[PDB]
Structure formats: structure tokens, C-alpha cells
Amino acid sequence: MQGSWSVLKKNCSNFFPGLLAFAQQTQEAYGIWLRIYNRQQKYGPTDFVEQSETFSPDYHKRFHSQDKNMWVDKELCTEVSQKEVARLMTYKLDMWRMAHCAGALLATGGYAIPFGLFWLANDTWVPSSFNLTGEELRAWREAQDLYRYRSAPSYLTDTKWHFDFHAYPWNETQERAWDDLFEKNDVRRDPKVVRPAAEMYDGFIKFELIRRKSLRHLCRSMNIPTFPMLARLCNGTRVRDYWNLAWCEDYMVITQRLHESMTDEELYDYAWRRYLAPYDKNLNREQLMERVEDYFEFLGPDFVAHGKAPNLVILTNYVLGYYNDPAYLEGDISELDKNDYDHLASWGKDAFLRRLEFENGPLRDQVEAHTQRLLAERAAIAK
């Protein structure tokens, strides 16, 4: 979304109340995170707590491993509720953006003020706390969805093009899953058909081998600030933490069937945090429930059985596929009756163009026959 004066006025008016609300949310989220971190350190697996090292097979660069460095706390409901987890995730996003802005301010002293003016003129990178009314919140969500639309197609295309150019699926079912994975949101994708793509891509690329450019695109699509990007293991850590929280909440909801009892707005927010339901689509409860059930089905039974989610790259692609809108086409079909090269009509045809028209025109067969006969006669005379 482009900046505007109205949004600038809105954010300037709500600047200090927004900061106060952000501080209160910071205290609450620190409490929640303290509970969660204590639980992880106490009951977490040895590899997860000790931060086991997983190195790439080519350049031996460490990155988070989905199996070892990610853990689903099945018993987190006792200490932390689902709403607290959602609050923590939202605060994590807001705190990331605020921390980047504060770092810029500290780095550049008082010279960041005009850049702050640019910042407050757009809702893309402002915290949710800056909105004090429903309309402002709707505009902020619209800006976030616009950024997601802007960013996701690049990530999807990167993944698909790299895999298709450097590899092909093994079997027909994998082919169908791969082809149907990257369909536009206007059609409904069957998670059962699409799941094998997760194993196929695990064979190709895991989350531990994700490239830095693809990571940048993904972080853009998740509304995670990317500047300064730095090494790939910082935003990678952010992504891992966010999706670990999301998986814990998803396990809680699946086990307790909370989504059925969840209200309409809370359900919409829950889907949105999973990048499943844009607000500009004006989805109803039926569609939200369908998408959430499809997401749970894609996670698969193994997620509940052992807390193991499918490949995170493929999961991110699948969820972001809902922001891959069909390519725009505007204009009545009658426009196809016009011509594009009328301005050249005055130039006419030169000798070469006339020759080409004569040779390759409707008389082409006659010209070919005459030319071949003449050439054969000349060759015979030569011999």
C-alpha cells in the first residue's frame, strides 16, 4: 500500500496511546513467553533444549532443523491458553517491526524523523495497537493483506521454478500434488492430493537448506521486516518461533475442537494468522471453516500423533497460495477487434517484403514449382 496523508494523521493522533498499549501488551506477552519458555526448558526434548546443530551437506552452514529444533508442546493448554498464544504471536510481529524502527532511530539519531514521517504515512509497518477503532483496524488489515499479495507470488514462483528446472517428481501422484499445489486461490485444492509434495520437497529441500533469497521472500509474505536482513539464521529463527507457536495452538485447537466453538471474528483472525483467509475476500463462517479444516487435514494425522508437521517450505507455499489471486484481465473482448500496427501502414512494403509476400503468399506453391523447375533445368544444362 502507498502512503497517504489521512493515514499519517491517523497514526500521528494515535501515536502515544499506541505506544502505551504496546507497552502493556509487552508486559503481558513477556509473562506469556516466560511461562512458555520455562515449560519448554523443563519438559522440552534434550535436542530442542540443547539446540542441536544441523549442518548443510554442501557448505556445512548451521540452520534450524524442523524435526529437532522444533517441538510441539502437547500439554501447553494446562499453563497457557489459545488466546494467550495468539496474543503472543501478534505481539511478536508488532515487536519485530517496532524493534527495527527503534534500531533505526538509535543508529541515526535525530535524522530518522523524516523517515518516521514516511513510516507513519503507511500502515504496512505500524503496530496493530495504533488503531483505536474498527475502521482503522480494517484499513491496517487491508494494508497487511496488500503486502502479502505483493510478496507471496514471488516466493511461490521461486520455489516452483527452482524445483521444476532442477528436478522432476518421481511418480504420478507426486506430479499431481506438485501441479495442484500452486493453483490460484479461485479453485479449491484438496489437501490429501497435495500432501505428497511435502515428502517430495523434503527429498529436494528441507527447512534447514532454505536459501536466503527465498527466506527473504517468505519473510516479506509473513509481514516480517527484512531490513537489515543479515544472515539467514535470524529471520529463520523468527519464522521457526512463529510457526512453532502456531503449531502448538493448532494442536490445542484440534485436540479441544476450539474452532467449532470459536466465534466468527476470532475464527477469521485465527485463519488470518495462518495466512489462509484474506480480509478483502469477505469470507463467511462456512468458507473459514472449510479452509481451517483443509489446513488441519494437510497437517495430517501424524501431527496429532507425534507433533510432526509436514515440510515447512511446502506448508508455507500451500497457505500462501490463498494470496495468489488470478492474473487480472480487464477490458471488453471487443477491444480485440482493433489493430496494433496501423501507424506503419503509411510505410508500405519494400522490395524484400514484397518478395516475401509473393513467395510465401497464396501463390507460394506456384512460385516454388516454377523456381524448382527452373533450377533443375539450369542444373541439367550445366551437366
Partner 1 sequence: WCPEVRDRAELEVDITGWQWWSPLEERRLLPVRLRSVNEVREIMSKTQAKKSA
Partner 2 sequence: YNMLVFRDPKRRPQLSEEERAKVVVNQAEWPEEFKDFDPDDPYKNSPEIIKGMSSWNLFLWGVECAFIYQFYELVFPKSI
Partner 3 sequence: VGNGPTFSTGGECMNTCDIQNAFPMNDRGVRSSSPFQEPNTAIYDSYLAWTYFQPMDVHIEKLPAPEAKYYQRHTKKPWDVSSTELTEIQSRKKYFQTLGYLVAFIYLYFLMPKEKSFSGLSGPDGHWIMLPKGRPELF
Ligand X SMILES: CCCCCCCCCCCCCCCCCC(=O)OC[C@H](COP(=O)([O-])OCC(O)COP(=O)([O-])OC[C@@H](COC(=O)CCCCCCCCCCCCCCCCC)OC(=O)CCCCCCCCCCCCCCCCC)OC(=O)CCCCCCCCCCCCCCCCC
In the complex, the residues that contact partner 3 under the rule CB under 8 A are 1-2, 146, 149-150, 325-334, 339-341, 344-345, 347-349, 353, 356-357, 359-362, 364
Q: Which does 167 bind (CB under 5 to 8 A by kind): partner 1, ligand X, partner 3, none?
A: partner 1
Q: Least distance from C-beta 380 to partner 2, angstroms?
A: 15
Q: Cα 210–214–220 angle (5° rounding)?
A: 125
Q: Is 211 in the site for ligand X (CB under 6 A)?
A: no
Q: In this chain, which of 138, 213, 306, 370 binds partner 1, going by CB under 8 A?
A: 213
In eight-state DSSP terms, residue 57 is T
Q: Which does 369 bind (CB under 5 to 8 A by kind): partner 2, partner 1, partner 3, none?
A: partner 2
For partner 2, the closer of residues 56 and 371 by Cβ is 371
Residue 70 to residue 47: CA distance in whole angstroms: 9
Reported as half-sphere exposure (CB side, CA atoms, 13 A), residue 377 has a value of: 6
**Residues 31-60 as x/- pattern, contact with ligand X by CB under 6 A:** --x---------------------------
Q: How many CB atoms lie within 10 A of CB 292?
A: 22
Q: Least distance from C-beta 124 to partner 3, angstroms?
A: 13
Q: In this chain, which of 118, 161, 168, 358 binds ligand X, going by CB under 6 A?
A: 118
Residue 318 to residue 206: CA distance in whole angstroms: 15
For partner 3, the closer of residues 26 and 287 by Cβ is 287
**Judged by CB under 6 A, which stretch of 112-120, 161-169, 285-293, 309-317 contacts ligand X?**
112-120
Q: Which does 382 bind (CB under 5 to 8 A by kind): partner 1, ligand X, partner 3, none?
A: none
Q: Which does 41 bind (CB under 5 to 8 A by kind): partner 3, partner 2, partner 1, none?
A: none
Size of the chain, expressed as the number of residues it contains? 383
* Contact in structure between 67 and 77 (CB atoms under 8 Å): no
Please list every residue in the chain followed by a chain break, i.e. its C lies more than 2.5 Å from the next written N. none
For ligand X, the closer of residues 113 and 375 by Cβ is 113
Amino acid at 253: V
Region 171-200 residues binding partner 1, contact defined as CB under 8 A? 175
Q: How many CB atoms lie within 10 A of CB 103?
A: 13
Q: How many residues bind ligand X (CB under 6 A)?
A: 45
The residues near 208 (Cβ < 8 Å, ≥ 6 apart) are 54, 56, 63, 64, 65, 66
Cell of 9: 494523521
Q: In this chain, which of 59, 365, 381, 383 binds partner 2, going by CB under 8 A?
A: 365
Q: Least distance from C-beta 336 to partner 1, angstroms?
A: 7
Q: How many CB atoms lie within 10 A of CB 71?
A: 18
Q: Which does 213 bind (CB under 5 to 8 A by kind): partner 1, partner 2, partner 3, none?
A: partner 1
Site of interaction with partner 2 (CB under 8 A): 351, 354-355, 358-360, 363-372, 374-375
